[PDB]
Amino acid sequence: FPRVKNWEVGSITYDTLSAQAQQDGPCTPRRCLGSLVFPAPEQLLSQARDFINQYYSSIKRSGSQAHEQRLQEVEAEVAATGTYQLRESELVFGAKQAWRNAPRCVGRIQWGKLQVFDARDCRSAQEMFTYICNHIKYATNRGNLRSAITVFPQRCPGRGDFRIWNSQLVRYAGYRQQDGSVRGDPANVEITELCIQHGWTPGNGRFDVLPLLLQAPDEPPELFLLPPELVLEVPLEHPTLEWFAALGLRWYALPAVSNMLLEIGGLEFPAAPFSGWYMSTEIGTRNLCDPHRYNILEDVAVCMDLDTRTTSSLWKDKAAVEINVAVLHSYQLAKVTIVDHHAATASFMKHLENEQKARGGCPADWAWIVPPISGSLTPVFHQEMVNYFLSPAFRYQPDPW
Amino acid sequence: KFPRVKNWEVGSITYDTLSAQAQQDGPCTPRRCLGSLVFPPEQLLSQARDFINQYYSSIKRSGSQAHEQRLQEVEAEVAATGTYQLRESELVFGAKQAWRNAPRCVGRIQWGKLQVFDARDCRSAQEMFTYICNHIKYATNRGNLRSAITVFPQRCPGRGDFRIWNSQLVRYAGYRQQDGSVRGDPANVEITELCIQHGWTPGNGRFDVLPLLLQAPDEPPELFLLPPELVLEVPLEHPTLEWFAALGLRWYALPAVSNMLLEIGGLEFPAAPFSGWYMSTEIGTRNLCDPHRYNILEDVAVCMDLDTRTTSSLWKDKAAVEINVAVLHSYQLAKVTIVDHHAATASFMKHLENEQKARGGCPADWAWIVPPISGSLTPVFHQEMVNYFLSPAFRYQPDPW
Numbered sequence A: 001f002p003r004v005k006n007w008e009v010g011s012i013t014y015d016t017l018s019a020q021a022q023q024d025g026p027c028t029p030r031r032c033l034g035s036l037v038f039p040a041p042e043q044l045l046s047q048a049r050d051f052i053n054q055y056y057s058s059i060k061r062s063g064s065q066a067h068e069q070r071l072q073e074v075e076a077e078v079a080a081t082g083t084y085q086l087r088e089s090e091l092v093f094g095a096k097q098a099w100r101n102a103p104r105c106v107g108r109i110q111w112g113k114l115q116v117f118d119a120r121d122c123r124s125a126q127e128m129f130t131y132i133c134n135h136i137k138y139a140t141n142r143g144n145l146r147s148a149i150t151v152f153p154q155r156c157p158g159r160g161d162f163r164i165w166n167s168q169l170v171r172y173a174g175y176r177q178q179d180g181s182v183r184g185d186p187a188n189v190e191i192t193e194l195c196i197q198h199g200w201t202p203g204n205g206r207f208d209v210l211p212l213l214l215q216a217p218d219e220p221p222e223l224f225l226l227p228p229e230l231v232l233e234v235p236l237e238h239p240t241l242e243w244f245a246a247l248g249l250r251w252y253a254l255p256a257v258s259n260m261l262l263e264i265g266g267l268e269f270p271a272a273p274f275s276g277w278y279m280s281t282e283i284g285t286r287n288l289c290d291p292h293r294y295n296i297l298e299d300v301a302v303c304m305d306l307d308t309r310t311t312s313s314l315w316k317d318k319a320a321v322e323i324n325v326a327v328l329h330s331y332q333l334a335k336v337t338i339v340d341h342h343a344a345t346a347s348f349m350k351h352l353e354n355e356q357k358a359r360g361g362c363p364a365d366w367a368w369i370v371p372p373i374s375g376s377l378t379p380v381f382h383q384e385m386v387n388y389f390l391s392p393a394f395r396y397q398p399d400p401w
Numbered sequence B: 001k002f003p004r005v006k007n008w009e010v011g012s013i014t015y016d017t018l019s020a021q022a023q024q025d026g027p028c029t030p031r032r033c034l035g036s037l038v039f040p041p042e043q044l045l046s047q048a049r050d051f052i053n054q055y056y057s058s059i060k061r062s063g064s065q066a067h068e069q070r071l072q073e074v075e076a077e078v079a080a081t082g083t084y085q086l087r088e089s090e091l092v093f094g095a096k097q098a099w100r101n102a103p104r105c106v107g108r109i110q111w112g113k114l115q116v117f118d119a120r121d122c123r124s125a126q127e128m129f130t131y132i133c134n135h136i137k138y139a140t141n142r143g144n145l146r147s148a149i150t151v152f153p154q155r156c157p158g159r160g161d162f163r164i165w166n167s168q169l170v171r172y173a174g175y176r177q178q179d180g181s182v183r184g185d186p187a188n189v190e191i192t193e194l195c196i197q198h199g200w201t202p203g204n205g206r207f208d209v210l211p212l213l214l215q216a217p218d219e220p221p222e223l224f225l226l227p228p229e230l231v232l233e234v235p236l237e238h239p240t241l242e243w244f245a246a247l248g249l250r251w252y253a254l255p256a257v258s259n260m261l262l263e264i265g266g267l268e269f270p271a272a273p274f275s276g277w278y279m280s281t282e283i284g285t286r287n288l289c290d291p292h293r294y295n296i297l298e299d300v301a302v303c304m305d306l307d308t309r310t311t312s313s314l315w316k317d318k319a320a321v322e323i324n325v326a327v328l329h330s331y332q333l334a335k336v337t338i339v340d341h342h343a344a345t346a347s348f349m350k351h352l353e354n355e356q357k358a359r360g361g362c363p364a365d366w367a368w369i370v371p372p373i374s375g376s377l378t379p380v381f382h383q384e385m386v387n388y389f390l391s392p393a394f395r396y397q398p399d400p401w
């Protein structure tokens, strides 16, 4: 078992949980690919049997009558139907484990506090849309955000997939420009083009909320506009730099990932959007300061009267810190849940300790856990981590187009 | 078998064909990634053969004249003596290649400009001290730093090793207390306790330069007071924060690692101190602000009148940036070579493109290349990287006790 050192404290643990890692990752003893972003009945039975084992351990009924009977129930169903159905309590437990197991999520101290909406009876894209609106309404909760997931019907033989084509429920349009630039969010150029191609009349602002493209099985995707009142947003201002408000920047309250696959016990839910709340660096650092995103860093630094002609002034670092301050101030002013990178990483350390006692380790992707600014100022920088895949899990999946 | 690697800023794709040559297995497996961990008889001929082939290809002389001839003499040397000695030019080429191959080094754009001092005819700590002193004075060069490595005699059985006991040639003392805690540098509490144990008169301050412990084969170590005019230091001041000087902070000009083991063509050099020049985050962020190092971050924030009562004021981030400003300002005013993390990472990207063409890839350790502040503000953050082991190499080794 790998030994894991924390260099700030000097302490040492062994990740015995990694030994149970089911699926395989991208590294070998020849070479590490840790930094890469994107790395049959008997085998369904095998995954199902293991998850069922997990569930019955969690309810302190391991090896019980009910446990054996559920094993045989799942075997009979797979033999007879090629698949099987989760009980509602198993789905709730599966969804929480998927969050708990997500190595790149720094917010996992909260994994047990998750609201699971069971939309496995959903029938169409219209019903899907209503479920999604209710998720957004509940999660947003007028700024006091609540973690949630809505699970749409599972992949099953004979029918197509439910799919949300959008990568998040709230996304700003990215318009390819006259001269070749992008107006709005460049991360969303492709989904923006798909939306117009599917009948959306575009806007031309920098913060135009996209419609949803919702796909029912064996159906073309269907365009749905979100009611403006469900989409809570936060104008960005800076507590001391009054000119900052004249940038006209905004961001939305709810981070709701909608393009990932939820796998539980070998069953695959290709549509299962989940939401929590933002860590301020996602917005302040990545969304606003990535060169390939809104790319405001230089314009802010010029306004700050920094010397932008030499890197050694650290104008980039200074302007990025004030952009992050503005995000935190703006969300607190608006009374919208947000966490800074110091508090989030400090809570993730408590998660790693809880997980050490509970399971013998914690799958964690150092390069995603450490924030994109002030890395070594946070405790996770000095924490060695073991990255591996546990199931239940959220997986990436191809775009449906 | 050739890992695809993407740069997410530009969207460009390369393939790392050089990874196919990786000899020494790393710590990662398909089951788990350990990339974030700091520290994870005639086989000598295959390593020697391989390194000689490397030498002659780099000078367009493969399969010709001196190549075969040199292949035979290394065979003969090992057959007769059980080892071999490097040609001077091979020693030069090997040191440069070990630097070039160092995955954690962001400064490898400089890898072709390296001054190699050949101390292979050394004997006794007194002689080492003279070599180390020539190195320091040459490398320092009145602040116009020049990269340099002094190569002490190789290892052979029956005879003990040459070892420099200090991790670096310049280290500040760490003195324990009537209460456990440390005055000075806590990274060096241990070598400070050894020097004191071996007869050194300790100081009282927080920036006392430690003396050297130099070890000849099979002889106990000898203390050596470094010539005080040979240790160039920089008192730290801030361009606009006048009180920053009064904090009494200093750092030394020359980063000279003196505990790593140079391996070329199967031969091992336990004493081969290499030096270059600092990247400013090394001092301003890690050495001064790590909680287990000088841990000055809150002291500067108090002086800046920052709100240390909430993490969301980003007082840690603001103080951090100013400390880094003060390092860059002080070193520039003292006319001592230094490179900020923006310039350094931009040059590393240049290096990768150079190495893609010259060798089909480059071993890079993402967690070490990305700077410890403002990570995603540098281009290397957005570059996927492949980590693997090539020879010749700088390898870690046990403390000589």
Ligand code: HEM
Binding pocket: A095, A099, A102, A104, A105, A106, A107, A108, A110, A114, A147, A148, A149, A274, A275, A276, A277, A278, A279, A282, A339, A344, A368, A394
């Ligand atoms: C409650 C507060 C939450 C916080 C503060 C938080 C924080 C984060 C952050 C900062 C990331 C990195 C995203 C990026 O850099 O693009 C992330 C990734 C992730 N989070 Fe969390 N999250 C929260 C809630 C949730 C919930 C409720 C779930 C699922 C039920 C979840 C599952 C995931 C997954 C699967 C990823 C990986 C996404 C990927 O690989 O691209 N998170 N989280």
Ligand code: HEM
Binding pocket: B095, B099, B102, B104, B105, B106, B107, B108, B110, B114, B147, B148, B149, B274, B275, B276, B277, B278, B279, B282, B339, B344, B368, B394
């Ligand atoms: C010329 C300017 C140079 C710069 C700016 C530079 C920069 C750096 C930095 C920032 C690190 C990370 C070390 C740490 O965080 O503790 C590093 C590591 C390293 N450097 Fe360079 N370096 C330079 C020259 C050299 C030279 C001349 C050599 C050898 C001949 C070298 C070999 C290494 C090695 C082996 C490591 C890995 C050490 C470790 O893993 O702790 N560097 N370098």
Ligand SMILES: Cc1cc(N)nc(-c2cc(CN(C)C)cc(F)c2F)c1
Binding pocket: A107, A255, A256, A257, A274, A275, A276, A277, A278, A279, A282, A283, A286, A287
């Ligand atoms: C539930 C949740 C909470 C949170 N705070 N972030 C995310 C999250 C965000 C992004 C967008 N990035 C460009 C920032 C990408 C992902 F893959 C995520 F998982 C998800």
Ligand SMILES: Cc1cc(N)nc(-c2cc(CN(C)C)cc(F)c2F)c1
Binding pocket: B255, B256, B257, B274, B275, B276, B277, B278, B279, B282, B286
């Ligand atoms: C030649 C060279 C140049 C440079 N800029 N740094 C280093 C360097 C520094 C440290 C100390 N760290 C705690 C910061 C550790 C290492 F292993 C290094 F290699 C070496």
Ligand SMILES: C[C@H](O)[C@H](O)[C@H]1CNc2nc(N)[nH]c(=O)c2N1
Binding pocket: A035, A036, A037, A367, A368, A369, B008, B381, B382, B383, B384, B385
């Ligand atoms: C190429 C590199 O792996 C990539 O930029 C990663 C690094 N770490 C990250 N970490 C988080 N949290 N989010 C990200 O998008 C990334 N991107």
Ligand SMILES: C[C@H](O)[C@H](O)[C@H]1CNc2nc(N)[nH]c(=O)c2N1
Binding pocket: A007, A381, A382, A383, A384, A385, B035, B036, B037, B038, B367, B368, B369
């Ligand atoms: C645990 C983690 O791997 C460790 O703190 C590493 C991360 N990256 C680093 N990068 C550099 N350049 N130097 C370091 O000491 C470290 N420490």
Ligand SMILES: [Cl-]
Binding pocket: A255, A282, A287
């Ligand atoms: Cl986002």
Ligand SMILES: [Cl-]
Binding pocket: B255, B282, B283, B287
């Ligand atoms: Cl150092």
Ligand SMILES: [Gd+3]
Binding pocket: A240, A241, A242
């Ligand atoms: Gd004002």
Ligand SMILES: [Gd+3]
Binding pocket: none
């Ligand atoms: Gd303008």
Ligand SMILES: [Gd+3]
Binding pocket: none
């Ligand atoms: Gd006062």
Ligand SMILES: [Zn+2]
Binding pocket: A027, A028, A031, A032, A033, A034, B028, B029, B032, B033, B034, B035
């Ligand atoms: Zn790895």
